[PDB]
Amino acid sequence: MEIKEVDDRAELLRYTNNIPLLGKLVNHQPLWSTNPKLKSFSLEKISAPDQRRVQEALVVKDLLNVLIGLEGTYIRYFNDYEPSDPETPIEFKIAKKMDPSFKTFSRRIVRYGKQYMILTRAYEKWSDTSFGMVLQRFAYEIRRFLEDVYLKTLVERLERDFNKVPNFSIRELEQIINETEVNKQMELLYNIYEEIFREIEERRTNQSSLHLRLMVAFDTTVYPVPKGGAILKIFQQKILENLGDRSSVMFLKKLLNNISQDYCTMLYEWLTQGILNDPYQEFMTYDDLERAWDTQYFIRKDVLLRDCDSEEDKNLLFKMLRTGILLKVVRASLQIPTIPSNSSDITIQEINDFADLMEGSNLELYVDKCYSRANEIFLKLFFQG
Amino acid sequence: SSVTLRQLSNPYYVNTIPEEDILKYVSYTLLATTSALFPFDHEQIQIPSKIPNFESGLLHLIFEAGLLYQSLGYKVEKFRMLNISPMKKALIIEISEELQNYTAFVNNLVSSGTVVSLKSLYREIYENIIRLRIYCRFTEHLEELSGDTFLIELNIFKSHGDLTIRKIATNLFNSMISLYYEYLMNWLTKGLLRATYGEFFIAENTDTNGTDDDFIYHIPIEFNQERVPAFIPKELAYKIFMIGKSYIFLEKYCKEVQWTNEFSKKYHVLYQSNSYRGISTNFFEI
């Protein structure tokens, strides 16, 4: 109701070389929490117990605000927050002077908002090229979960009810949040993000022929950030950890299917043409030329789906490498960049449901069917041609 | 107590604008058009008093779109009056089409009248916010550098894990590589170097050391190894350079007019028939 004569102005930001590709380019709003404007009212004037409903009505406004990531009037940002800081933490004060109905349940929603903020910033932080494609594709998915499920449901529905329903209740607020089960989904994304951060901090922390006749050697090197094999391992681990929640299972399955489309394209294309095309250097192995006769190949163990410690996963990996090399030499000798489909009888398909293939009992079946294809065509090559 | 809570709350806030008129003003300004509450000074917005912090932040979030619109408009108006590379105006025309599409989408939203509150406007355009944002970030240095720099950058971006960035980069890349395909055709079919303005890796050398090295002992065409974009294999680049030098050598001194012309027309048809593949294996075969 008052005026604080604050020059609130909107203008784009001057610096461009430190804000990621999707980073927002508008100046941050003016800091009500320390630079107040136009009202500083303490509800102690209206802290009468009968006014309790009236009080929460005001409260409702502010809470219906924070969930979109913008702080409410009767919510102050903590002295820690600094808008020019991209990595500042998220914490903020709400007055205990009101009835607990103000404060108790609100803590649940604001956490949502807290994570709603970090995800958004993550939605930006992972947009950089050096983070490889998988998270980058993952970036897309997180955005959708906000602008098609969180907002279009919650914001639309909540505003409609607060404008139409006679005295909509915060209890009904919780009931409609969970009746659309969004919170659990958002929590799954949250915890996956926490594990990603854990792996990043681990890698930022500690910087420091006999039988199969393969002309191969390990290249064990660590990069500051996790890559696709790590991410897929992670999703497998989480789905394993939460067997039983049918909705959780279906959601995570859709995630796995959605993220690795062209990754599966790359793997299938290599197993059926021996051609490796990884402009981000995320695939399992990589070639020389960092003449093409000693085509020595190296394992980047840091991106493999398995510890490759026992005999069976080593067997799988080595069959993979051999199959690729065989098809590659076939192409090199016949002077054709592509292998026609109808050269043989064993026909192979793409990994249309990577979710179950990752579990086991089908991974090796696919691998050794491709191995059979490779052996038959290769032997026909050096026996007839 | 069968009453409306927002009605229980609104007259408590006495000195603020009816949110309906807030919508009224935001719809005009969304295209960075000044009006009663928000006079753009062509560079910023003055948000007046009687506006809660909430409304200020949301107006920040929304008006990002108008700021981007104005900046991109300045870019477009600034370059349509200049003399620059053809790929540059390829970027200009694509950005202009994007701006027109944004105009159409915004005014269609205004006409159909599905806007009811600020957050609705937020969710409706957030995608177009991102689209404008990416379009802005991709051209931060249009004024200084050359196009083939952008060709390489866009080629790299074609594999970006984002679907939206996928589509945008592919479109821009396709248009410029069609024009660059025209450059390559011109070199392979006539051996000229006209109107390339330093975006092509095969250069002509007018030099004074050895004043007769354009008369007898030399052919002043030069392959600069470092200037080949990543979508062309190096050995095929050598092949291309030798093809052009071959054509020059036959035409200028050998005088193989009939053979060179018939060969040229045949291969002219052969490439011009495949322009819809761009850069691909078939082209390498020819």
Author numbering:
A (entry chain D): 1 to 208, 225 to 306, 318 to 412
B (entry chain C): 163 to 448
Text of the article:
In budding yeast, homologues of the grip-containing proteins (GCPs) GCP2 and GCP3 (Spc97p and Spc98p) and two copies of γ–tubulin (Tub4p) form a 300 kDa complex (γTuSC). Spc110p, a distant pericentrin homologue, recruits this complex to the nuclear face of the spindle pole body (SPB), while Spc72p recruits it to the cytoplasmic face. In yeast, the CM1 motif is required for seven identical γTuSCs to helically assemble into a γTuRC at the SPB.
To better resolve fundamental questions about the molecular basis for γTuRC assembly and activation, we determined the cryo-EM structure of unassembled γTuSC, without Spc110p or filament formation, from images of frozen-hydrated single particles. At the concentration of ~1 µM used in data collection, micrographs and 2D classes show a mixture of γTuSC monomers and dimers, with a small number of larger oligomers. We were able to obtain a structure of the γTuSC monomer at ~3.7 Å, and of a γTuSC dimer at ~4.5 Å resolution. As initially observed in negative stain EM, our new cryo-EM structures of monomeric and dimeric γTuSCs show that Spc97p and Spc98p intrinsically adopt an open conformation at the intra-γTuSC interface such that the attached γ-tubulins fail to make MT-like lateral contacts. In order to assess the changes that occur during assembly of monomeric γTuSCs into the γTuRC and the subsequent closure, we aligned the N-terminal two helical bundles of Spc97p and Spc98p (residues Spc97p52-276 and Spc98p178-342). During the transition from monomer to assembled open state (as seen in γTuRCWT), the γ-tubulins move in the same overall direction, approximately orthogonal to the plane of the Spc97p/Spc98p contact interface. The large conformational change in Spc98p that occurs to create these contacts in the γTuSC dimer is a major contributor to the even larger-scale changes during γTuRC assembly and activation.
